[model samples]
Target: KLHISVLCGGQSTEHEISIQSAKNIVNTLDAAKYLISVIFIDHVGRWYLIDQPEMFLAHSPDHLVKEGSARPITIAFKPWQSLDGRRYSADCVFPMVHGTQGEDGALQGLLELLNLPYVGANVQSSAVCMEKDLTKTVLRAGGIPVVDWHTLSPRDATEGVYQRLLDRWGTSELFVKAVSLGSSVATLPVKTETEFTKAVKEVFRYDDRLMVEPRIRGREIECAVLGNGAPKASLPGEIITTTTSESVTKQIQQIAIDAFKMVHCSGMARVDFFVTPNNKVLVNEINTIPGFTNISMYPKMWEASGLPCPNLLDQLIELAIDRHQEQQKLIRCYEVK
Candidate 1:
């Protein structure tokens, strides 16, 4: 059995959603092939070991704060060592945290330091993907067509924010959102000064960095990419949403592969895009650790493409270990020859 430690929740706004995603995964995970241990990170960033993970998840995760064993663990020199002085054995880690600490590179960094193989992108990719501003910069430079956008510091964005967009976009609607967040949290429509200021405050509440873009009308679409080195793109899926026909969908899938490669993503990622009315494709965002809920577009898109969630999980685990072994083949240090 593959010893898998699924970590969820974190000091992010998506804590509850992360727990929910974990619930779905743990419940669906085939126990015969895997021994699953769960670590729930509370709202304040405290980690607890949930014994009888299924039992702990029996009820809504909202009450998990006081339920799990209060014992916290750490990364020991050899494997993870709990306070009991034993190694927290796990062949792999599946992180389900959304937003900042969990979905970002922080958790990946810890896993990398502990020399443990985990699912999803590496530290660098996770970090870059979490920052909308940076993700666009890298993707656009890689020849992917990205929507026109700019960053906003939380500290600023006074009434001048409305004035700026009005002066810049002028009559064009705009959207403002926290640059470092996910699940559409802190994203607000900003076509006027009142909306811009109110939305800026909300964005600042979660992230100090914000992104402003001219809201272009189009069909919102998404595509899933998997693997390393030579990645494969799933059948492009629409969001009940297209106009430019297969040509556009085909382009979306192709660009998704290019964008995924340019970002140096491993395992899996969901690339979202907006198909403009003029047949122009604009990249919207990329999620390194997308939500795994049944209704989420990431899994839905893959499932629609004939790769069910179970097989998708299998591929993800295999890719993670494969990459780890590949990295292990590299020389760790310079030897005096």
Candidate 2:
């Protein structure tokens, strides 16, 4: 049986959210298909192996906090052993850590160093997707229609910039967001200059870089993408306000697939967009590691496209294993004397 490790509990504000995501994933993945090992990385950034599934499910953090609670380990390449001298091994990694240490490409980088195949985007895509400004820049360059945004700086936090933003975007209603945070942690909707200034200040607390985008009175649509070479786009779905069109859906899926490829994302990703009143589709953003929570729309979109949760999870794991094997065949180190 393949030993698949499910990692959660990242050192980000989304700690509990990450745990909740892991709960559904662990419950959904078929036990008969693979042997699952749970790894909990505590708030302080300590890694613990979940030996007992019951304890982990019942009270994970309570057990992980204890000094001698479990085996504390680190990864290595030269010797391929943990710091405790144990054989740290896994066939594939299902890294579901949602923020900062997990989703920002740090974990992906470590997995790459260990020569271990993992789920979701690689270091480049993860890093690119993590920054909203950068994602838009690349997507727009690739001919993807994205919501135009105006960047803000701490020193340039003035009403003048807000006015200039409105003139440029042509929309008074806007979304002020931290360029590098997720789960809408530091996001605010504003319609006036006063509100925009306050929103910008608020987001500055969460991330150094801030961006403002025109708020579209449009349908919130999302599409799920899967695979590598020839990535497939699932049927698009409308979120909250329900009004979808076939023409828009087709265009959204194609744009989503294009953004996914341009971003260099892998395994799986959820591409979000806004279908404006005029039927204009504007790319919102691409979530590299979308939530698996009860309310998450990523899996729901795939389900609407005829791929159920169980089947979707299975395909993602299969993709991870496939990428690892293929990459290992390439030449790595070359000696030139």
Candidate 3:
């Protein structure tokens, strides 16, 4: 049986959601085919070994802090061995941590060093998707239609900048967001000058860089992509939005597949889009490690496409191992005389 480690709960805004995602994954993983281990990262960035995966269903900060059932541990290079000499080995990793250190390539970088095969995007793709500005830059260059945005600095925080965006987009309604955050944790919708100023300041607290985008009055759609090479896009799914014909669904799925390839994502990703009233599709952003909670759109979309959560997890684990084997064949260093 393959030993699969589900890494969740990080120093991100979505810590609770991450735990929920991990719980769902743990419950779905086939016991006869795999041995499951849960690793929890506290809010302040401490790691713990969860003896029972089911324990995470009732997890909170207090569960790891006040309660003493979960044991403290550290990730090390040696297989299954921690700094304190405990064994926590895994054949593969299913990263469930969302945003910041978890989704932003920091954790992926560490996994790369540990020589472990992990599900989802690699270091470069994770870092690229984490920053909204860069995600737009690449997508736009690849001929994808994305919502217009302006990267803001401290000096650019002024009424004039806001007016420029308003004049260009012809909409007073705008969204101010921390460029590197997820789950709308640092996003604010504003219109007035005062609201704009306060929104920018609030967003800056979470990130050094901020972004402003005109609020598009449109439907929120999500598509799930799975695989390594020749990835497949699932049928489009709506997040409480209007309906679309078959053609529109096909268009959105193709764009999602394109976005996935453009971002060089592996294993899986959930591509979000805004479909305007005119049937115009705009790429919002791609989530590399999308939430796998029971209600998350990624797994739901896949299930809608006839692939259930258990089968999806199997494919993801296979993809991770497949990518790792391919990467191992690459020459690491040149011959030096």
Candidate 4:
């Protein structure tokens, strides 16, 4: 049986969502083929070993381990260690943490140093995808269509600049959001000077940097990509609207695959897009470690494409270990005779 450590809950703003995702994952994992452990990271970055995976399955908050109930644990120097000093080892790690330290490569870096095979994108890809501006930059450079956007600091949020952007994009309205946040936590719509100032202030609470883009009055669409090398795209899923033609849906799926590769993502990702009223498709952003809740589009799209959650989990675990083995064969030293 493969010992899989499901890591979830971080200092990210998406903490609750991560917990929900982990619960779904734990419930779906095949018990006969896998030995599972849950590691919870509290809001302040402390780590604890959950005693029972069933604890997360309960709907009541009392069954969950609060900060005081669970004892904080340390990962020892070896690849396997618990606070009680029992012999423990893991074949792979399925990281469900989202945003910030979870999705921004910090956790992946630690796992890499520990010689642990883990799911989702590597350090470089995770870091890039977590930042919206950088994700757009790579996509745009790859000839993929992304929304027209730019970054902003505190001083850049002025009326003159706001009007300048509005004129530049030929749109009276715009969208401003944290550059590195997920779940639309710090996103706000802007149309006037008052709204723009408030949006900047609100976003700055969560991020030192923010992005501004002309609002795309269009249909929202998403596609899921899976695998390591030669990844395949699932059938595109429309958000609130599903009126897109077959050709456009195919085009979006292909673009999603390209964007996934352009950003050096592996394991899986959910590529979001916007289709304008005129039928122009533009890449919104790519989520390296997308939400895996029962309602999340990533898994839902795959299920819609004929892959169930259990099978999807199986593929993700296999991909994680496969990539690790492939990397192990690389020559890491030079010998002089």
Candidate 5:
């Protein structure tokens, strides 16, 4: 059996969603072929090993690990040891974590130091995708269509936000978001000055940097990409707003495979795009570690594209191993000439 350690949760607004995703992945894995262990990171950034999913569900408050569980023990980063001094080793790490610290390059860098095989994009890709500003820059550089936008730091916005907005795109409505986070936690739609100011403040609460982009009135679409080099695209899926009862045409699904390749992402990723009112398709953002709940579009798109959940998991594991082996063969030292 392949021993896999699944990392979930983190000090991000998407912590609850991360837990939900981890649960879905764990529940879907075939127990006979994989030995799975759940590692939870609390909102305060503490790490704990959850032995039983049931126990975790029962005691965890809203998916946040409670203070009373003796079975779930803390983990140390350096030397990679558990609370009982047991070495936390795994064939590969399946990080189901989302948003800021986890989905960004931070966690991937730690895994690199530990020399562990893990799923999804490497440090550079994760860093680029996590920041909306950087993503737009890279995608645009790659000739990928992206929405019009401007980026500003939290401090600058907090000081004279309204003036900045007026100077950037006077009287135009915009979307405000934390540059390095996900799950729509700090995402807000700003129409007026009041809304813009309030939204900027709220977004700053989530990150030191923020991105503001013109609101593209269009359909929201998503696509799933799998594999490393020459990745394949899954059937495009559209996000139907429950409140608005509006269906967004997701044309990016058609180009999702190329988008992933353009971003140099491996393992798996879900690329989001917006179809503007003029029928122009623009790349929204790419999620390296997107939500994996049963309802999430990441896995759902794969399932819709004919790959079942179990088979999708199998493919992800295979990709992780393939990436590790490829990295191991690279010559690290160069001869002095």
Candidate 6:
């Protein structure tokens, strides 16, 4: 049986969402094929192993049991070794997490250090995709059409940098966001100069760098891509807003697939884009560790494309193992040249 550990929750705004996603996965995962462990990372970055889901489901932070209580206990990051002291071995790590520390390469780096196989993108891909500005820069360099935007540092935002951005892009509705983050955390829609300045100042609360891009008028469609080396695109899935429908036909799905290829993503990635008023599709951003909640777009889109949740989970695990094996082929220790 494949032993898998599902890591979720972290020091991010999406911690609660991560917990919910983990709950969903644990509930749906096939017990016959996998021995699953639910590991929770608290807001303070403390790791805990939930011995019994009941304990975790019962206690709240405000109403915790005594120190030696029978509640789900905390686990130290050091003793990550198995009972045999031969390093904890997990066939694969399913990190159904969102936002900063969880999905932004922090946990991926830890998994790499532990030599653990994990589902989704690696450290480099996670790090690059977490930073919207960096993702756009790389994609634009690769001949991909990214929405026009400008980046500002937290220091600049405090030092009246919105004026500089306005001077550069002129007065237009823009989306201000914190770089190196996801889940629309610290994202704001700014239409006027006052809103722009306020939103920029607000976004500085989240990160050192901020990105401001013109609000591309278009449908926000997302497509799921899976694989490494030569990746294949899943059937196109679009994000339907109350007033707008973002349909992804074969042509549009190809655009998203091309963008995913440009990013060198592995395992799976959800490419979000904007189909402009002029009927042109522009790559918006790529989510390396997309959400996995029951209502999340990634799995739901895959389901709509003929892969159900359980099957998708199985596929991701298989991909994780394959990637680990492929990466292990590299010579880690080499003689001096």
lDDT of 2 by residue, 67-172 (tens): 4444565665621244447664578899988878787899999988888878989999999898889999999998889989877878874758778878887878
> Stretches of candidate 4 above 4 Å error?
59-71, 78-80, 155-159, 183-185, 241-244, 331-337
Model 2 scores a C-alpha lDDT of 0.80
Residue pairs with colliding backbones in model 1 are: none
Model 6 lowest lDDT segment of ten: 61-70
Best candidate, lDDT: 3
Collision count of model 6:
0
Clashing pairs in 4: none
Write down the TM-score of every candidate.
Answer: 0.88, 0.90, 0.93, 0.92, 0.85, 0.85
Task: Report how far residue 118 has shifted in candidate 2, in Å.
Answer: 0.2
Query: CA shift at 225, candidate 4, in angstroms?
Result: 0.7
Model 1 C-alpha lDDT per residue in residues 202-288, reported as the tens digit of each score? 888877788888888887878899888888888877775321177887898899999889989999898988888898998988988
Q: How many residue pairs clash in each candidate?
A: 0, 0, 0, 0, 1, 0
**Candidate 4 lDDT, 1-337, residue by residue in tens:** 8988888888888888888888889989988888877778887787766646666566422234553434466786635455557545678999899888888999999998887889989999999899999999988998999999979987763667788887799987988899987656688989987888888889998888999899899989889999888888888888893321988988898998888899889899989999999989999888988889888888889998999989999999999999998876552422321
Error of 2 at 39 (Å): 1.1
Residue-wise C-alpha lDDT for candidate 3, range 8-103, written one tens digit per residue? 899888898898899899989988888787888888888777756666556653475458656777767634454347787788999999988888
Ranking by lDDT: 3, 4, 2, 1, 5, 6
Better candidate by TM-score, 3 or 4: 3
Q: Report, for every candidate in turn, its global Cα lDDT versus the true structure.
A: 0.79, 0.80, 0.86, 0.84, 0.77, 0.73
Across 279-304, the per-residue lDDT of candidate 5 in tens digits comes to: 78888889999889988888988888
Each prediction's RMSD to truth: 3.1, 2.8, 2.4, 2.6, 4.1, 4.0
- The TM-score leader among the candidates is 3
Winner of 2 and 3 under lDDT: 3
Give the per-residue lDDT of model 6 (tens digit) for 104-198: 88888888876778898888888888898998998899988877778888655345555666677665678898887664658899877788888
